[PDB]
């Protein structure tokens, strides 16, 4: 039932609200020896690995900290760069932190931006006539459920993949939406909704659904 | 126990080494041993020397200290070893096994793409194949 | 509905936030609206829900008008009443329920004060129309709380009729 994240977007498709329910990325450390079978590749502010995803270090695991010292985009905290640090041998044997890039907020904005067309262009040239767009997009280790307001706003959340009974939960987040837009209808789509009162009401909906009850519509 | 090995083509002989178990065949009948084979195909051939069977020839041809045991394939190849022992305690069963082995070694020399069929057996490998045959069953 | 009133009140606040420039005068405008409400509700409920009989004495009228107004407004009387010795003029009436949160509330950066003052305005109307001119402040202390500064002639008057 655990929800990885919750989201809502506007007629613009802009990400209006992106509360995340605290789902951390995996981490790995191991006392690295002479040049590592991890195939380290520099790609544009990413210091990652392209191959040999061993020991639970995925390919996408971006270098996060070096020898305890943090590493920043391409170089490190102290001014050393990943390349100079790495290819110098006698530093080894050493520890390297690695994990996946928690996409900084702006990147999440970009992600929602690029996704919106897929919603609006979910093969509008469908087989089935006078069709309707996307609503449910299952994926590897998450599943996306969206609730169109049937006119206007989109309601997408990110849940545990193997689950049902979430579209009613979307209806209830729609109810929370109504509750908040009662606040100031001038406080409209144009500005994003960051009003901590409604937001902790949402996190209480989260609190209820973390516990067993998703039956017992109580929010 | 001289096994004058002799594969024959359609008519001519691709490989006919002169070897046995111990060392080379001194006796100077070689070219005229092939002539023994030719007098085979002159009088002993009958209507029989070529057949369409994996050919058991228990002594198609015999003489003193020299006993020919034959074999023929559908490809008209003549396979012949000679029992050059007036008698030794070896019975035709291992001779059949030997023509099995010789069949297989010859046809695995045949397995070469480079070696054109009907030519002198170049393979020192098929050599050592025949050589182990002789060193074993002579 | 609940939510229709919340919406109409959001349009209240927004109309103020439009043709009002700064926050304290916006609270003043809310207070004016509250006076408008009280000015007629008190005379209404003299009869129907207040035993049809007038009541003059201070604390009794305070508490009973509190309750009757809340029953015919939301049906929920204020949760407690404090009257403070250290300033006999200083009384506090405190209700954990804000009228505002029918729509859950405003930005928490620009406007420290909210509808709390508009309810305080209705309070001021009823007090001053009963015979109790007073100034009321809304504070975000222990939830929606209020404080009342009665009238001096009134404060002497009841201080005198503390006996009969």
């Amino acid at each position: 039932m655990i929800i990885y994240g919750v989201y809502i977007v506007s007629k613009s498709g802009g990400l209006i609200f992106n509360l995340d329910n605290n789902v951390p990325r995996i981490e790995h450390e191991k006392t690295f020896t002479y040049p590592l079978d991890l195939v380290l590749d520099y790609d544009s502010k990413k210091v990652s690995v392209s191959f040999n995803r061993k020991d639970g270090i995925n390919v996408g695991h971006v270098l996060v900290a070096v020898n305890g010292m943090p590493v920043n985009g391409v170089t490190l905290d102290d001014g050393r760069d990943v390349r100079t640090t790495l290819d110098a041998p006698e530093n080894y044997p050493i520890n390297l932190k690695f994990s996946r890039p928690k996409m900084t907020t702006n990147e999440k904005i970009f992600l929602a931006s690029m996704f919106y067309p897929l919603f609006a262009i979910a093969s509008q040239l469908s087989p089935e006539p006078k069709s309707s767009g996307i609503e449910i997009l299952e994926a590897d280790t998450f599943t996306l459920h969206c609730f169109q307001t049937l006119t206007g706003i989109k309601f997408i959340i990110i849940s545990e993949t193997g689950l049902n009974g979430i579209d009613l939960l979307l209806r209830k987040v729609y109810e929370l939406y109504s509750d908040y837009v009662l606040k100031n209808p001038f406080y409209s789509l144009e500005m994003p909704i960051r009003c901590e009162l409604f937001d902790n009401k949402l996190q209480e909906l989260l609190a209820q659904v973390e516990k067993t009850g998703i039956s017992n519509i109580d929010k | 126990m001289a096994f004058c090995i002799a594969v024959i083509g359609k008519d001519n002989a691709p490989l006919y080494l002169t070897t046995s178990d111990m060392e080379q065949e001194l006796e100077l009948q070689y070219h005229v041993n092939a002539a023994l084979d030719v007098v085979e195909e002159k009088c002993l051939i009958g209507k029989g020397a070529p057949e369409s069977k994996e050919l058991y020839l228990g002594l198609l041809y015999s003489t003193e200290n020299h006993k020919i045991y034959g074999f023929v394939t559908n490809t008209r190849v003549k396979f012949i070893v000679v029992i050059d022992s007036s008698n030794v305690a070896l019975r035709e069963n291992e001779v059949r096994a030997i023509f099995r082995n010789l069949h297989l070694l010859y046809t695995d020399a045949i397995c070469n793409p480079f070696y054109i069929p009907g030519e002198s057996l170049t393979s020192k490998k098929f050599d050592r194949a025949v050589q182990k045959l002789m060193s074993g069953t002579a | 509905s609940q939510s229709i009133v919340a919406l109409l009140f959001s349009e209240i606040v927004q109309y103020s936030q439009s043709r009002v420039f700064t926050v304290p005068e916006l609270q003043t405008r809310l207070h004016d609206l509250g006076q408008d409400v009280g000015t007629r509700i008190i005379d209404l409920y003299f009869v129907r829900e207040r035993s049809s009989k007038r009541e003059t004495k201070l604390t009794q009228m305070l508490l009973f008008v509190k309750t009757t107004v809340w029953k015919n407004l939301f049906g929920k009387e204020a949760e407690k009443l404090e009257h403070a010795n250290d300033d006999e003029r200083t009384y506090y009436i405190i209700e954990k329920e804000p009228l505002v949160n029918t729509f859950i509330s405003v930005p928490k950066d620009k406007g420290s004060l909210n509808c709390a003052n508009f309810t305080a305005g209705i309070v001021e109307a009823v007090l001053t129309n009963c015979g109790f001119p007073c100034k009321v402040t809304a504070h975000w202390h222990k939830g929606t709380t209020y404080m009342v500064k009665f009238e001096d002639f009134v404060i002497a008057r009841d201080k005198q009729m503390e006996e009969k």
Partner: protein, 169 residues
């Protein structure tokens, strides 16, 4: 449950109207101003009435008509009564016997050119526009003007929401 008393909503509406009469001298301005605030009401009223019930979008006008009468009976607790269709069935009339907003208030004779309860027409407008649906609504008869009961018009000139929820935007 609505958890609130009809008179309190009426007093808030009277506070608005009186405050408009004060702040702005003319009835036409205060009326257009309130119609704007009601337009902005509708942008939340219609989504609420959808959160209470995901009604069908539209196959016909009277389907929207009884949807909105349902909504009117929801928040105002008062059952309306649709009537007076077009020959083309496109436009209808809406009946309120007594609006908590409209009632408990009569009008000083100076304000005849004022259309008082027009906040509802604004509500309908904005409600139909957030639902991407183009309609014209004005109170052809109002309880205050001497009309028996408030009567509206609902002129659905054209469409803005398509059959697929992609729509034009």
């Amino acid at each position: 449950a609505k958890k609130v008393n009809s008179e309190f909503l009426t007093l808030t509406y009277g506070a608005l109207v009186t405050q408009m009469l004060r702040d702005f001298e003319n009835a036409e301005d205060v009326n257009k101003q309130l119609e704007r605030i009601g337009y902005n009401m509708g942008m939340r009223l219609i989504e609420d009435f959808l959160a209470r019930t995901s009604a069908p979008r539209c196959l016909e006008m009277r389907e929207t008509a009884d949807r909105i009468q349902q909504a009117f009976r929801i928040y105002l607790n008062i059952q309306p009564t649709i009537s007076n269709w077009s020959p083309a069935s496109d436009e209808f009339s809406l009946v309120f016997d007594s609006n908590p907003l409209t009632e408990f208030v009569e009008l000083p004779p100076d304000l005849t050119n004022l259309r008082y309860s027009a906040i509802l027409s604004g509500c309908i407008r904005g409600a139909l526009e957030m639902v991407q649906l183009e309609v014209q609504c004005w109170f052809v008869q109002d309880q205050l003007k001497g009309d028996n009961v408030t009567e509206l018009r609902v002129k659905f000139v054209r469409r803005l929401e398509e059959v697929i929820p992609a729509g034009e935007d």
